[PDB]
Amino acid sequence: DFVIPPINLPENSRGPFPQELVRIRSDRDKNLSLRYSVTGPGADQPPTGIFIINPISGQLSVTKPLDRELIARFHLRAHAVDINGNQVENPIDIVINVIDMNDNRPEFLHQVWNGSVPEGSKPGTYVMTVTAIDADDPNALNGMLRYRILSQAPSTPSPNMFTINNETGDIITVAAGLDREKVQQYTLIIQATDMEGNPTYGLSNTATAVITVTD
């Protein structure tokens, strides 16, 4: 059987509500007066009453904004009965897809990450890994993260002792002169940004990396 095409609806709709979607009817209406209903999560199951259908026309509507991070897809069924109570069609599958909007900023697992690097390490020495997560769709830009260092303290012998791999979160030395007797700890502020790290449209968050110089 051919499947009723899915309805694709972006989350966080402004409305106004209720909002008409599509019209579901039976061709048996040619000789019979029909009554339409819908069942399933979003309809007669939790969360109740988000989608509704006009008993007479079969016009399907949505009554509230949706949130993809709560429910990504709704499986409903449409029902047809005539005015004498006769069931005239087998109930038919309907699919509503909720389309992602970038409505979550990246989140770091820990607010403070700790790591260490030996005294006198050569440039290009691996130090530690920091990472974030994004609650939006991973397969979209809305959930794709990039990393950068915003500040380093203290600023000696070089104000940029480290860099960070912008996709992996790996922190690595790019400079020499790490001496425990001179400077014992560095504090870096790490930023994560979604939308592939786009500075204009991405959402960002920050975290702290503390790096101790060892013997």
Provide the binding-site residues for a second copy, judged by CB under 8 A: 1-6, 22-28, 78, 80, 89, 92
Determine, following the binding rule CB under 5 A, whether residue 194 of this chain makes contact with Ca ion: yes
Q: Which partner from the list a second copy, Ca ion, none does 215 bind, CB cut-off 5 to 8 Å by kind?
A: none
Q: Is there a binding annotation on residue 167?
A: no
Part of the chain binding Ca ion (CB under 5 A), chosen from 24-32, 46-54, 149-157, 190-198: 190-198
DSSP 125-165: -EEEE--EE-SS-TTSGGG--EEEEEEEES--S-S--EEE-
CA atoms within 13 A on the CB side of 151: 7
* Phi-psi region at 150: left, alpha or beta (left = phi > 0; alpha = psi -120 to 50): alpha
Q: What value does the CA radius of gyration of the chain take, rounded to a whole number of Å?
A: 28
Cβ pair 129, 169 in contact under 8 A? yes
CA–CA distance, 82 with 46 (Å, rounded to integer): 27
Q: Is there a binding annotation on residue 20?
A: no
Q: Which partner from the list a second copy, Ca ion, none does 173 bind, CB cut-off 5 to 8 Å by kind?
A: none
CA–CA distance, 207 with 40 (Å, rounded to integer): 42
Which lies closer to a second copy via its Cβ, residue 6 or residue 154?
A: 6
The C-alpha angle 164, 145, 204, rounded to 5 degrees, equals 90
Which lies closer to a second copy via its Cβ, residue 23 or residue 73?
A: 23
Q: Which partner from the list a second copy, Ca ion, none does 92 bind, CB cut-off 5 to 8 Å by kind?
A: a second copy
Q: Is there a binding annotation on residue 139?
A: no
Residues numbered 113 to 142 that lie near Ca ion (CB under 5 A) are 134, 136, 142
Residues of each annotated binding site: 11, 67, 69, 100-104, 134, 136, 142, 194
Residues of each annotated binding site for Ca(2+): 11, 67, 69, 100-104, 134, 136, 142, 194
Applying CB under 5 A, which residues contact Ca ion? 67-69, 100, 102-104, 134, 136, 142, 194
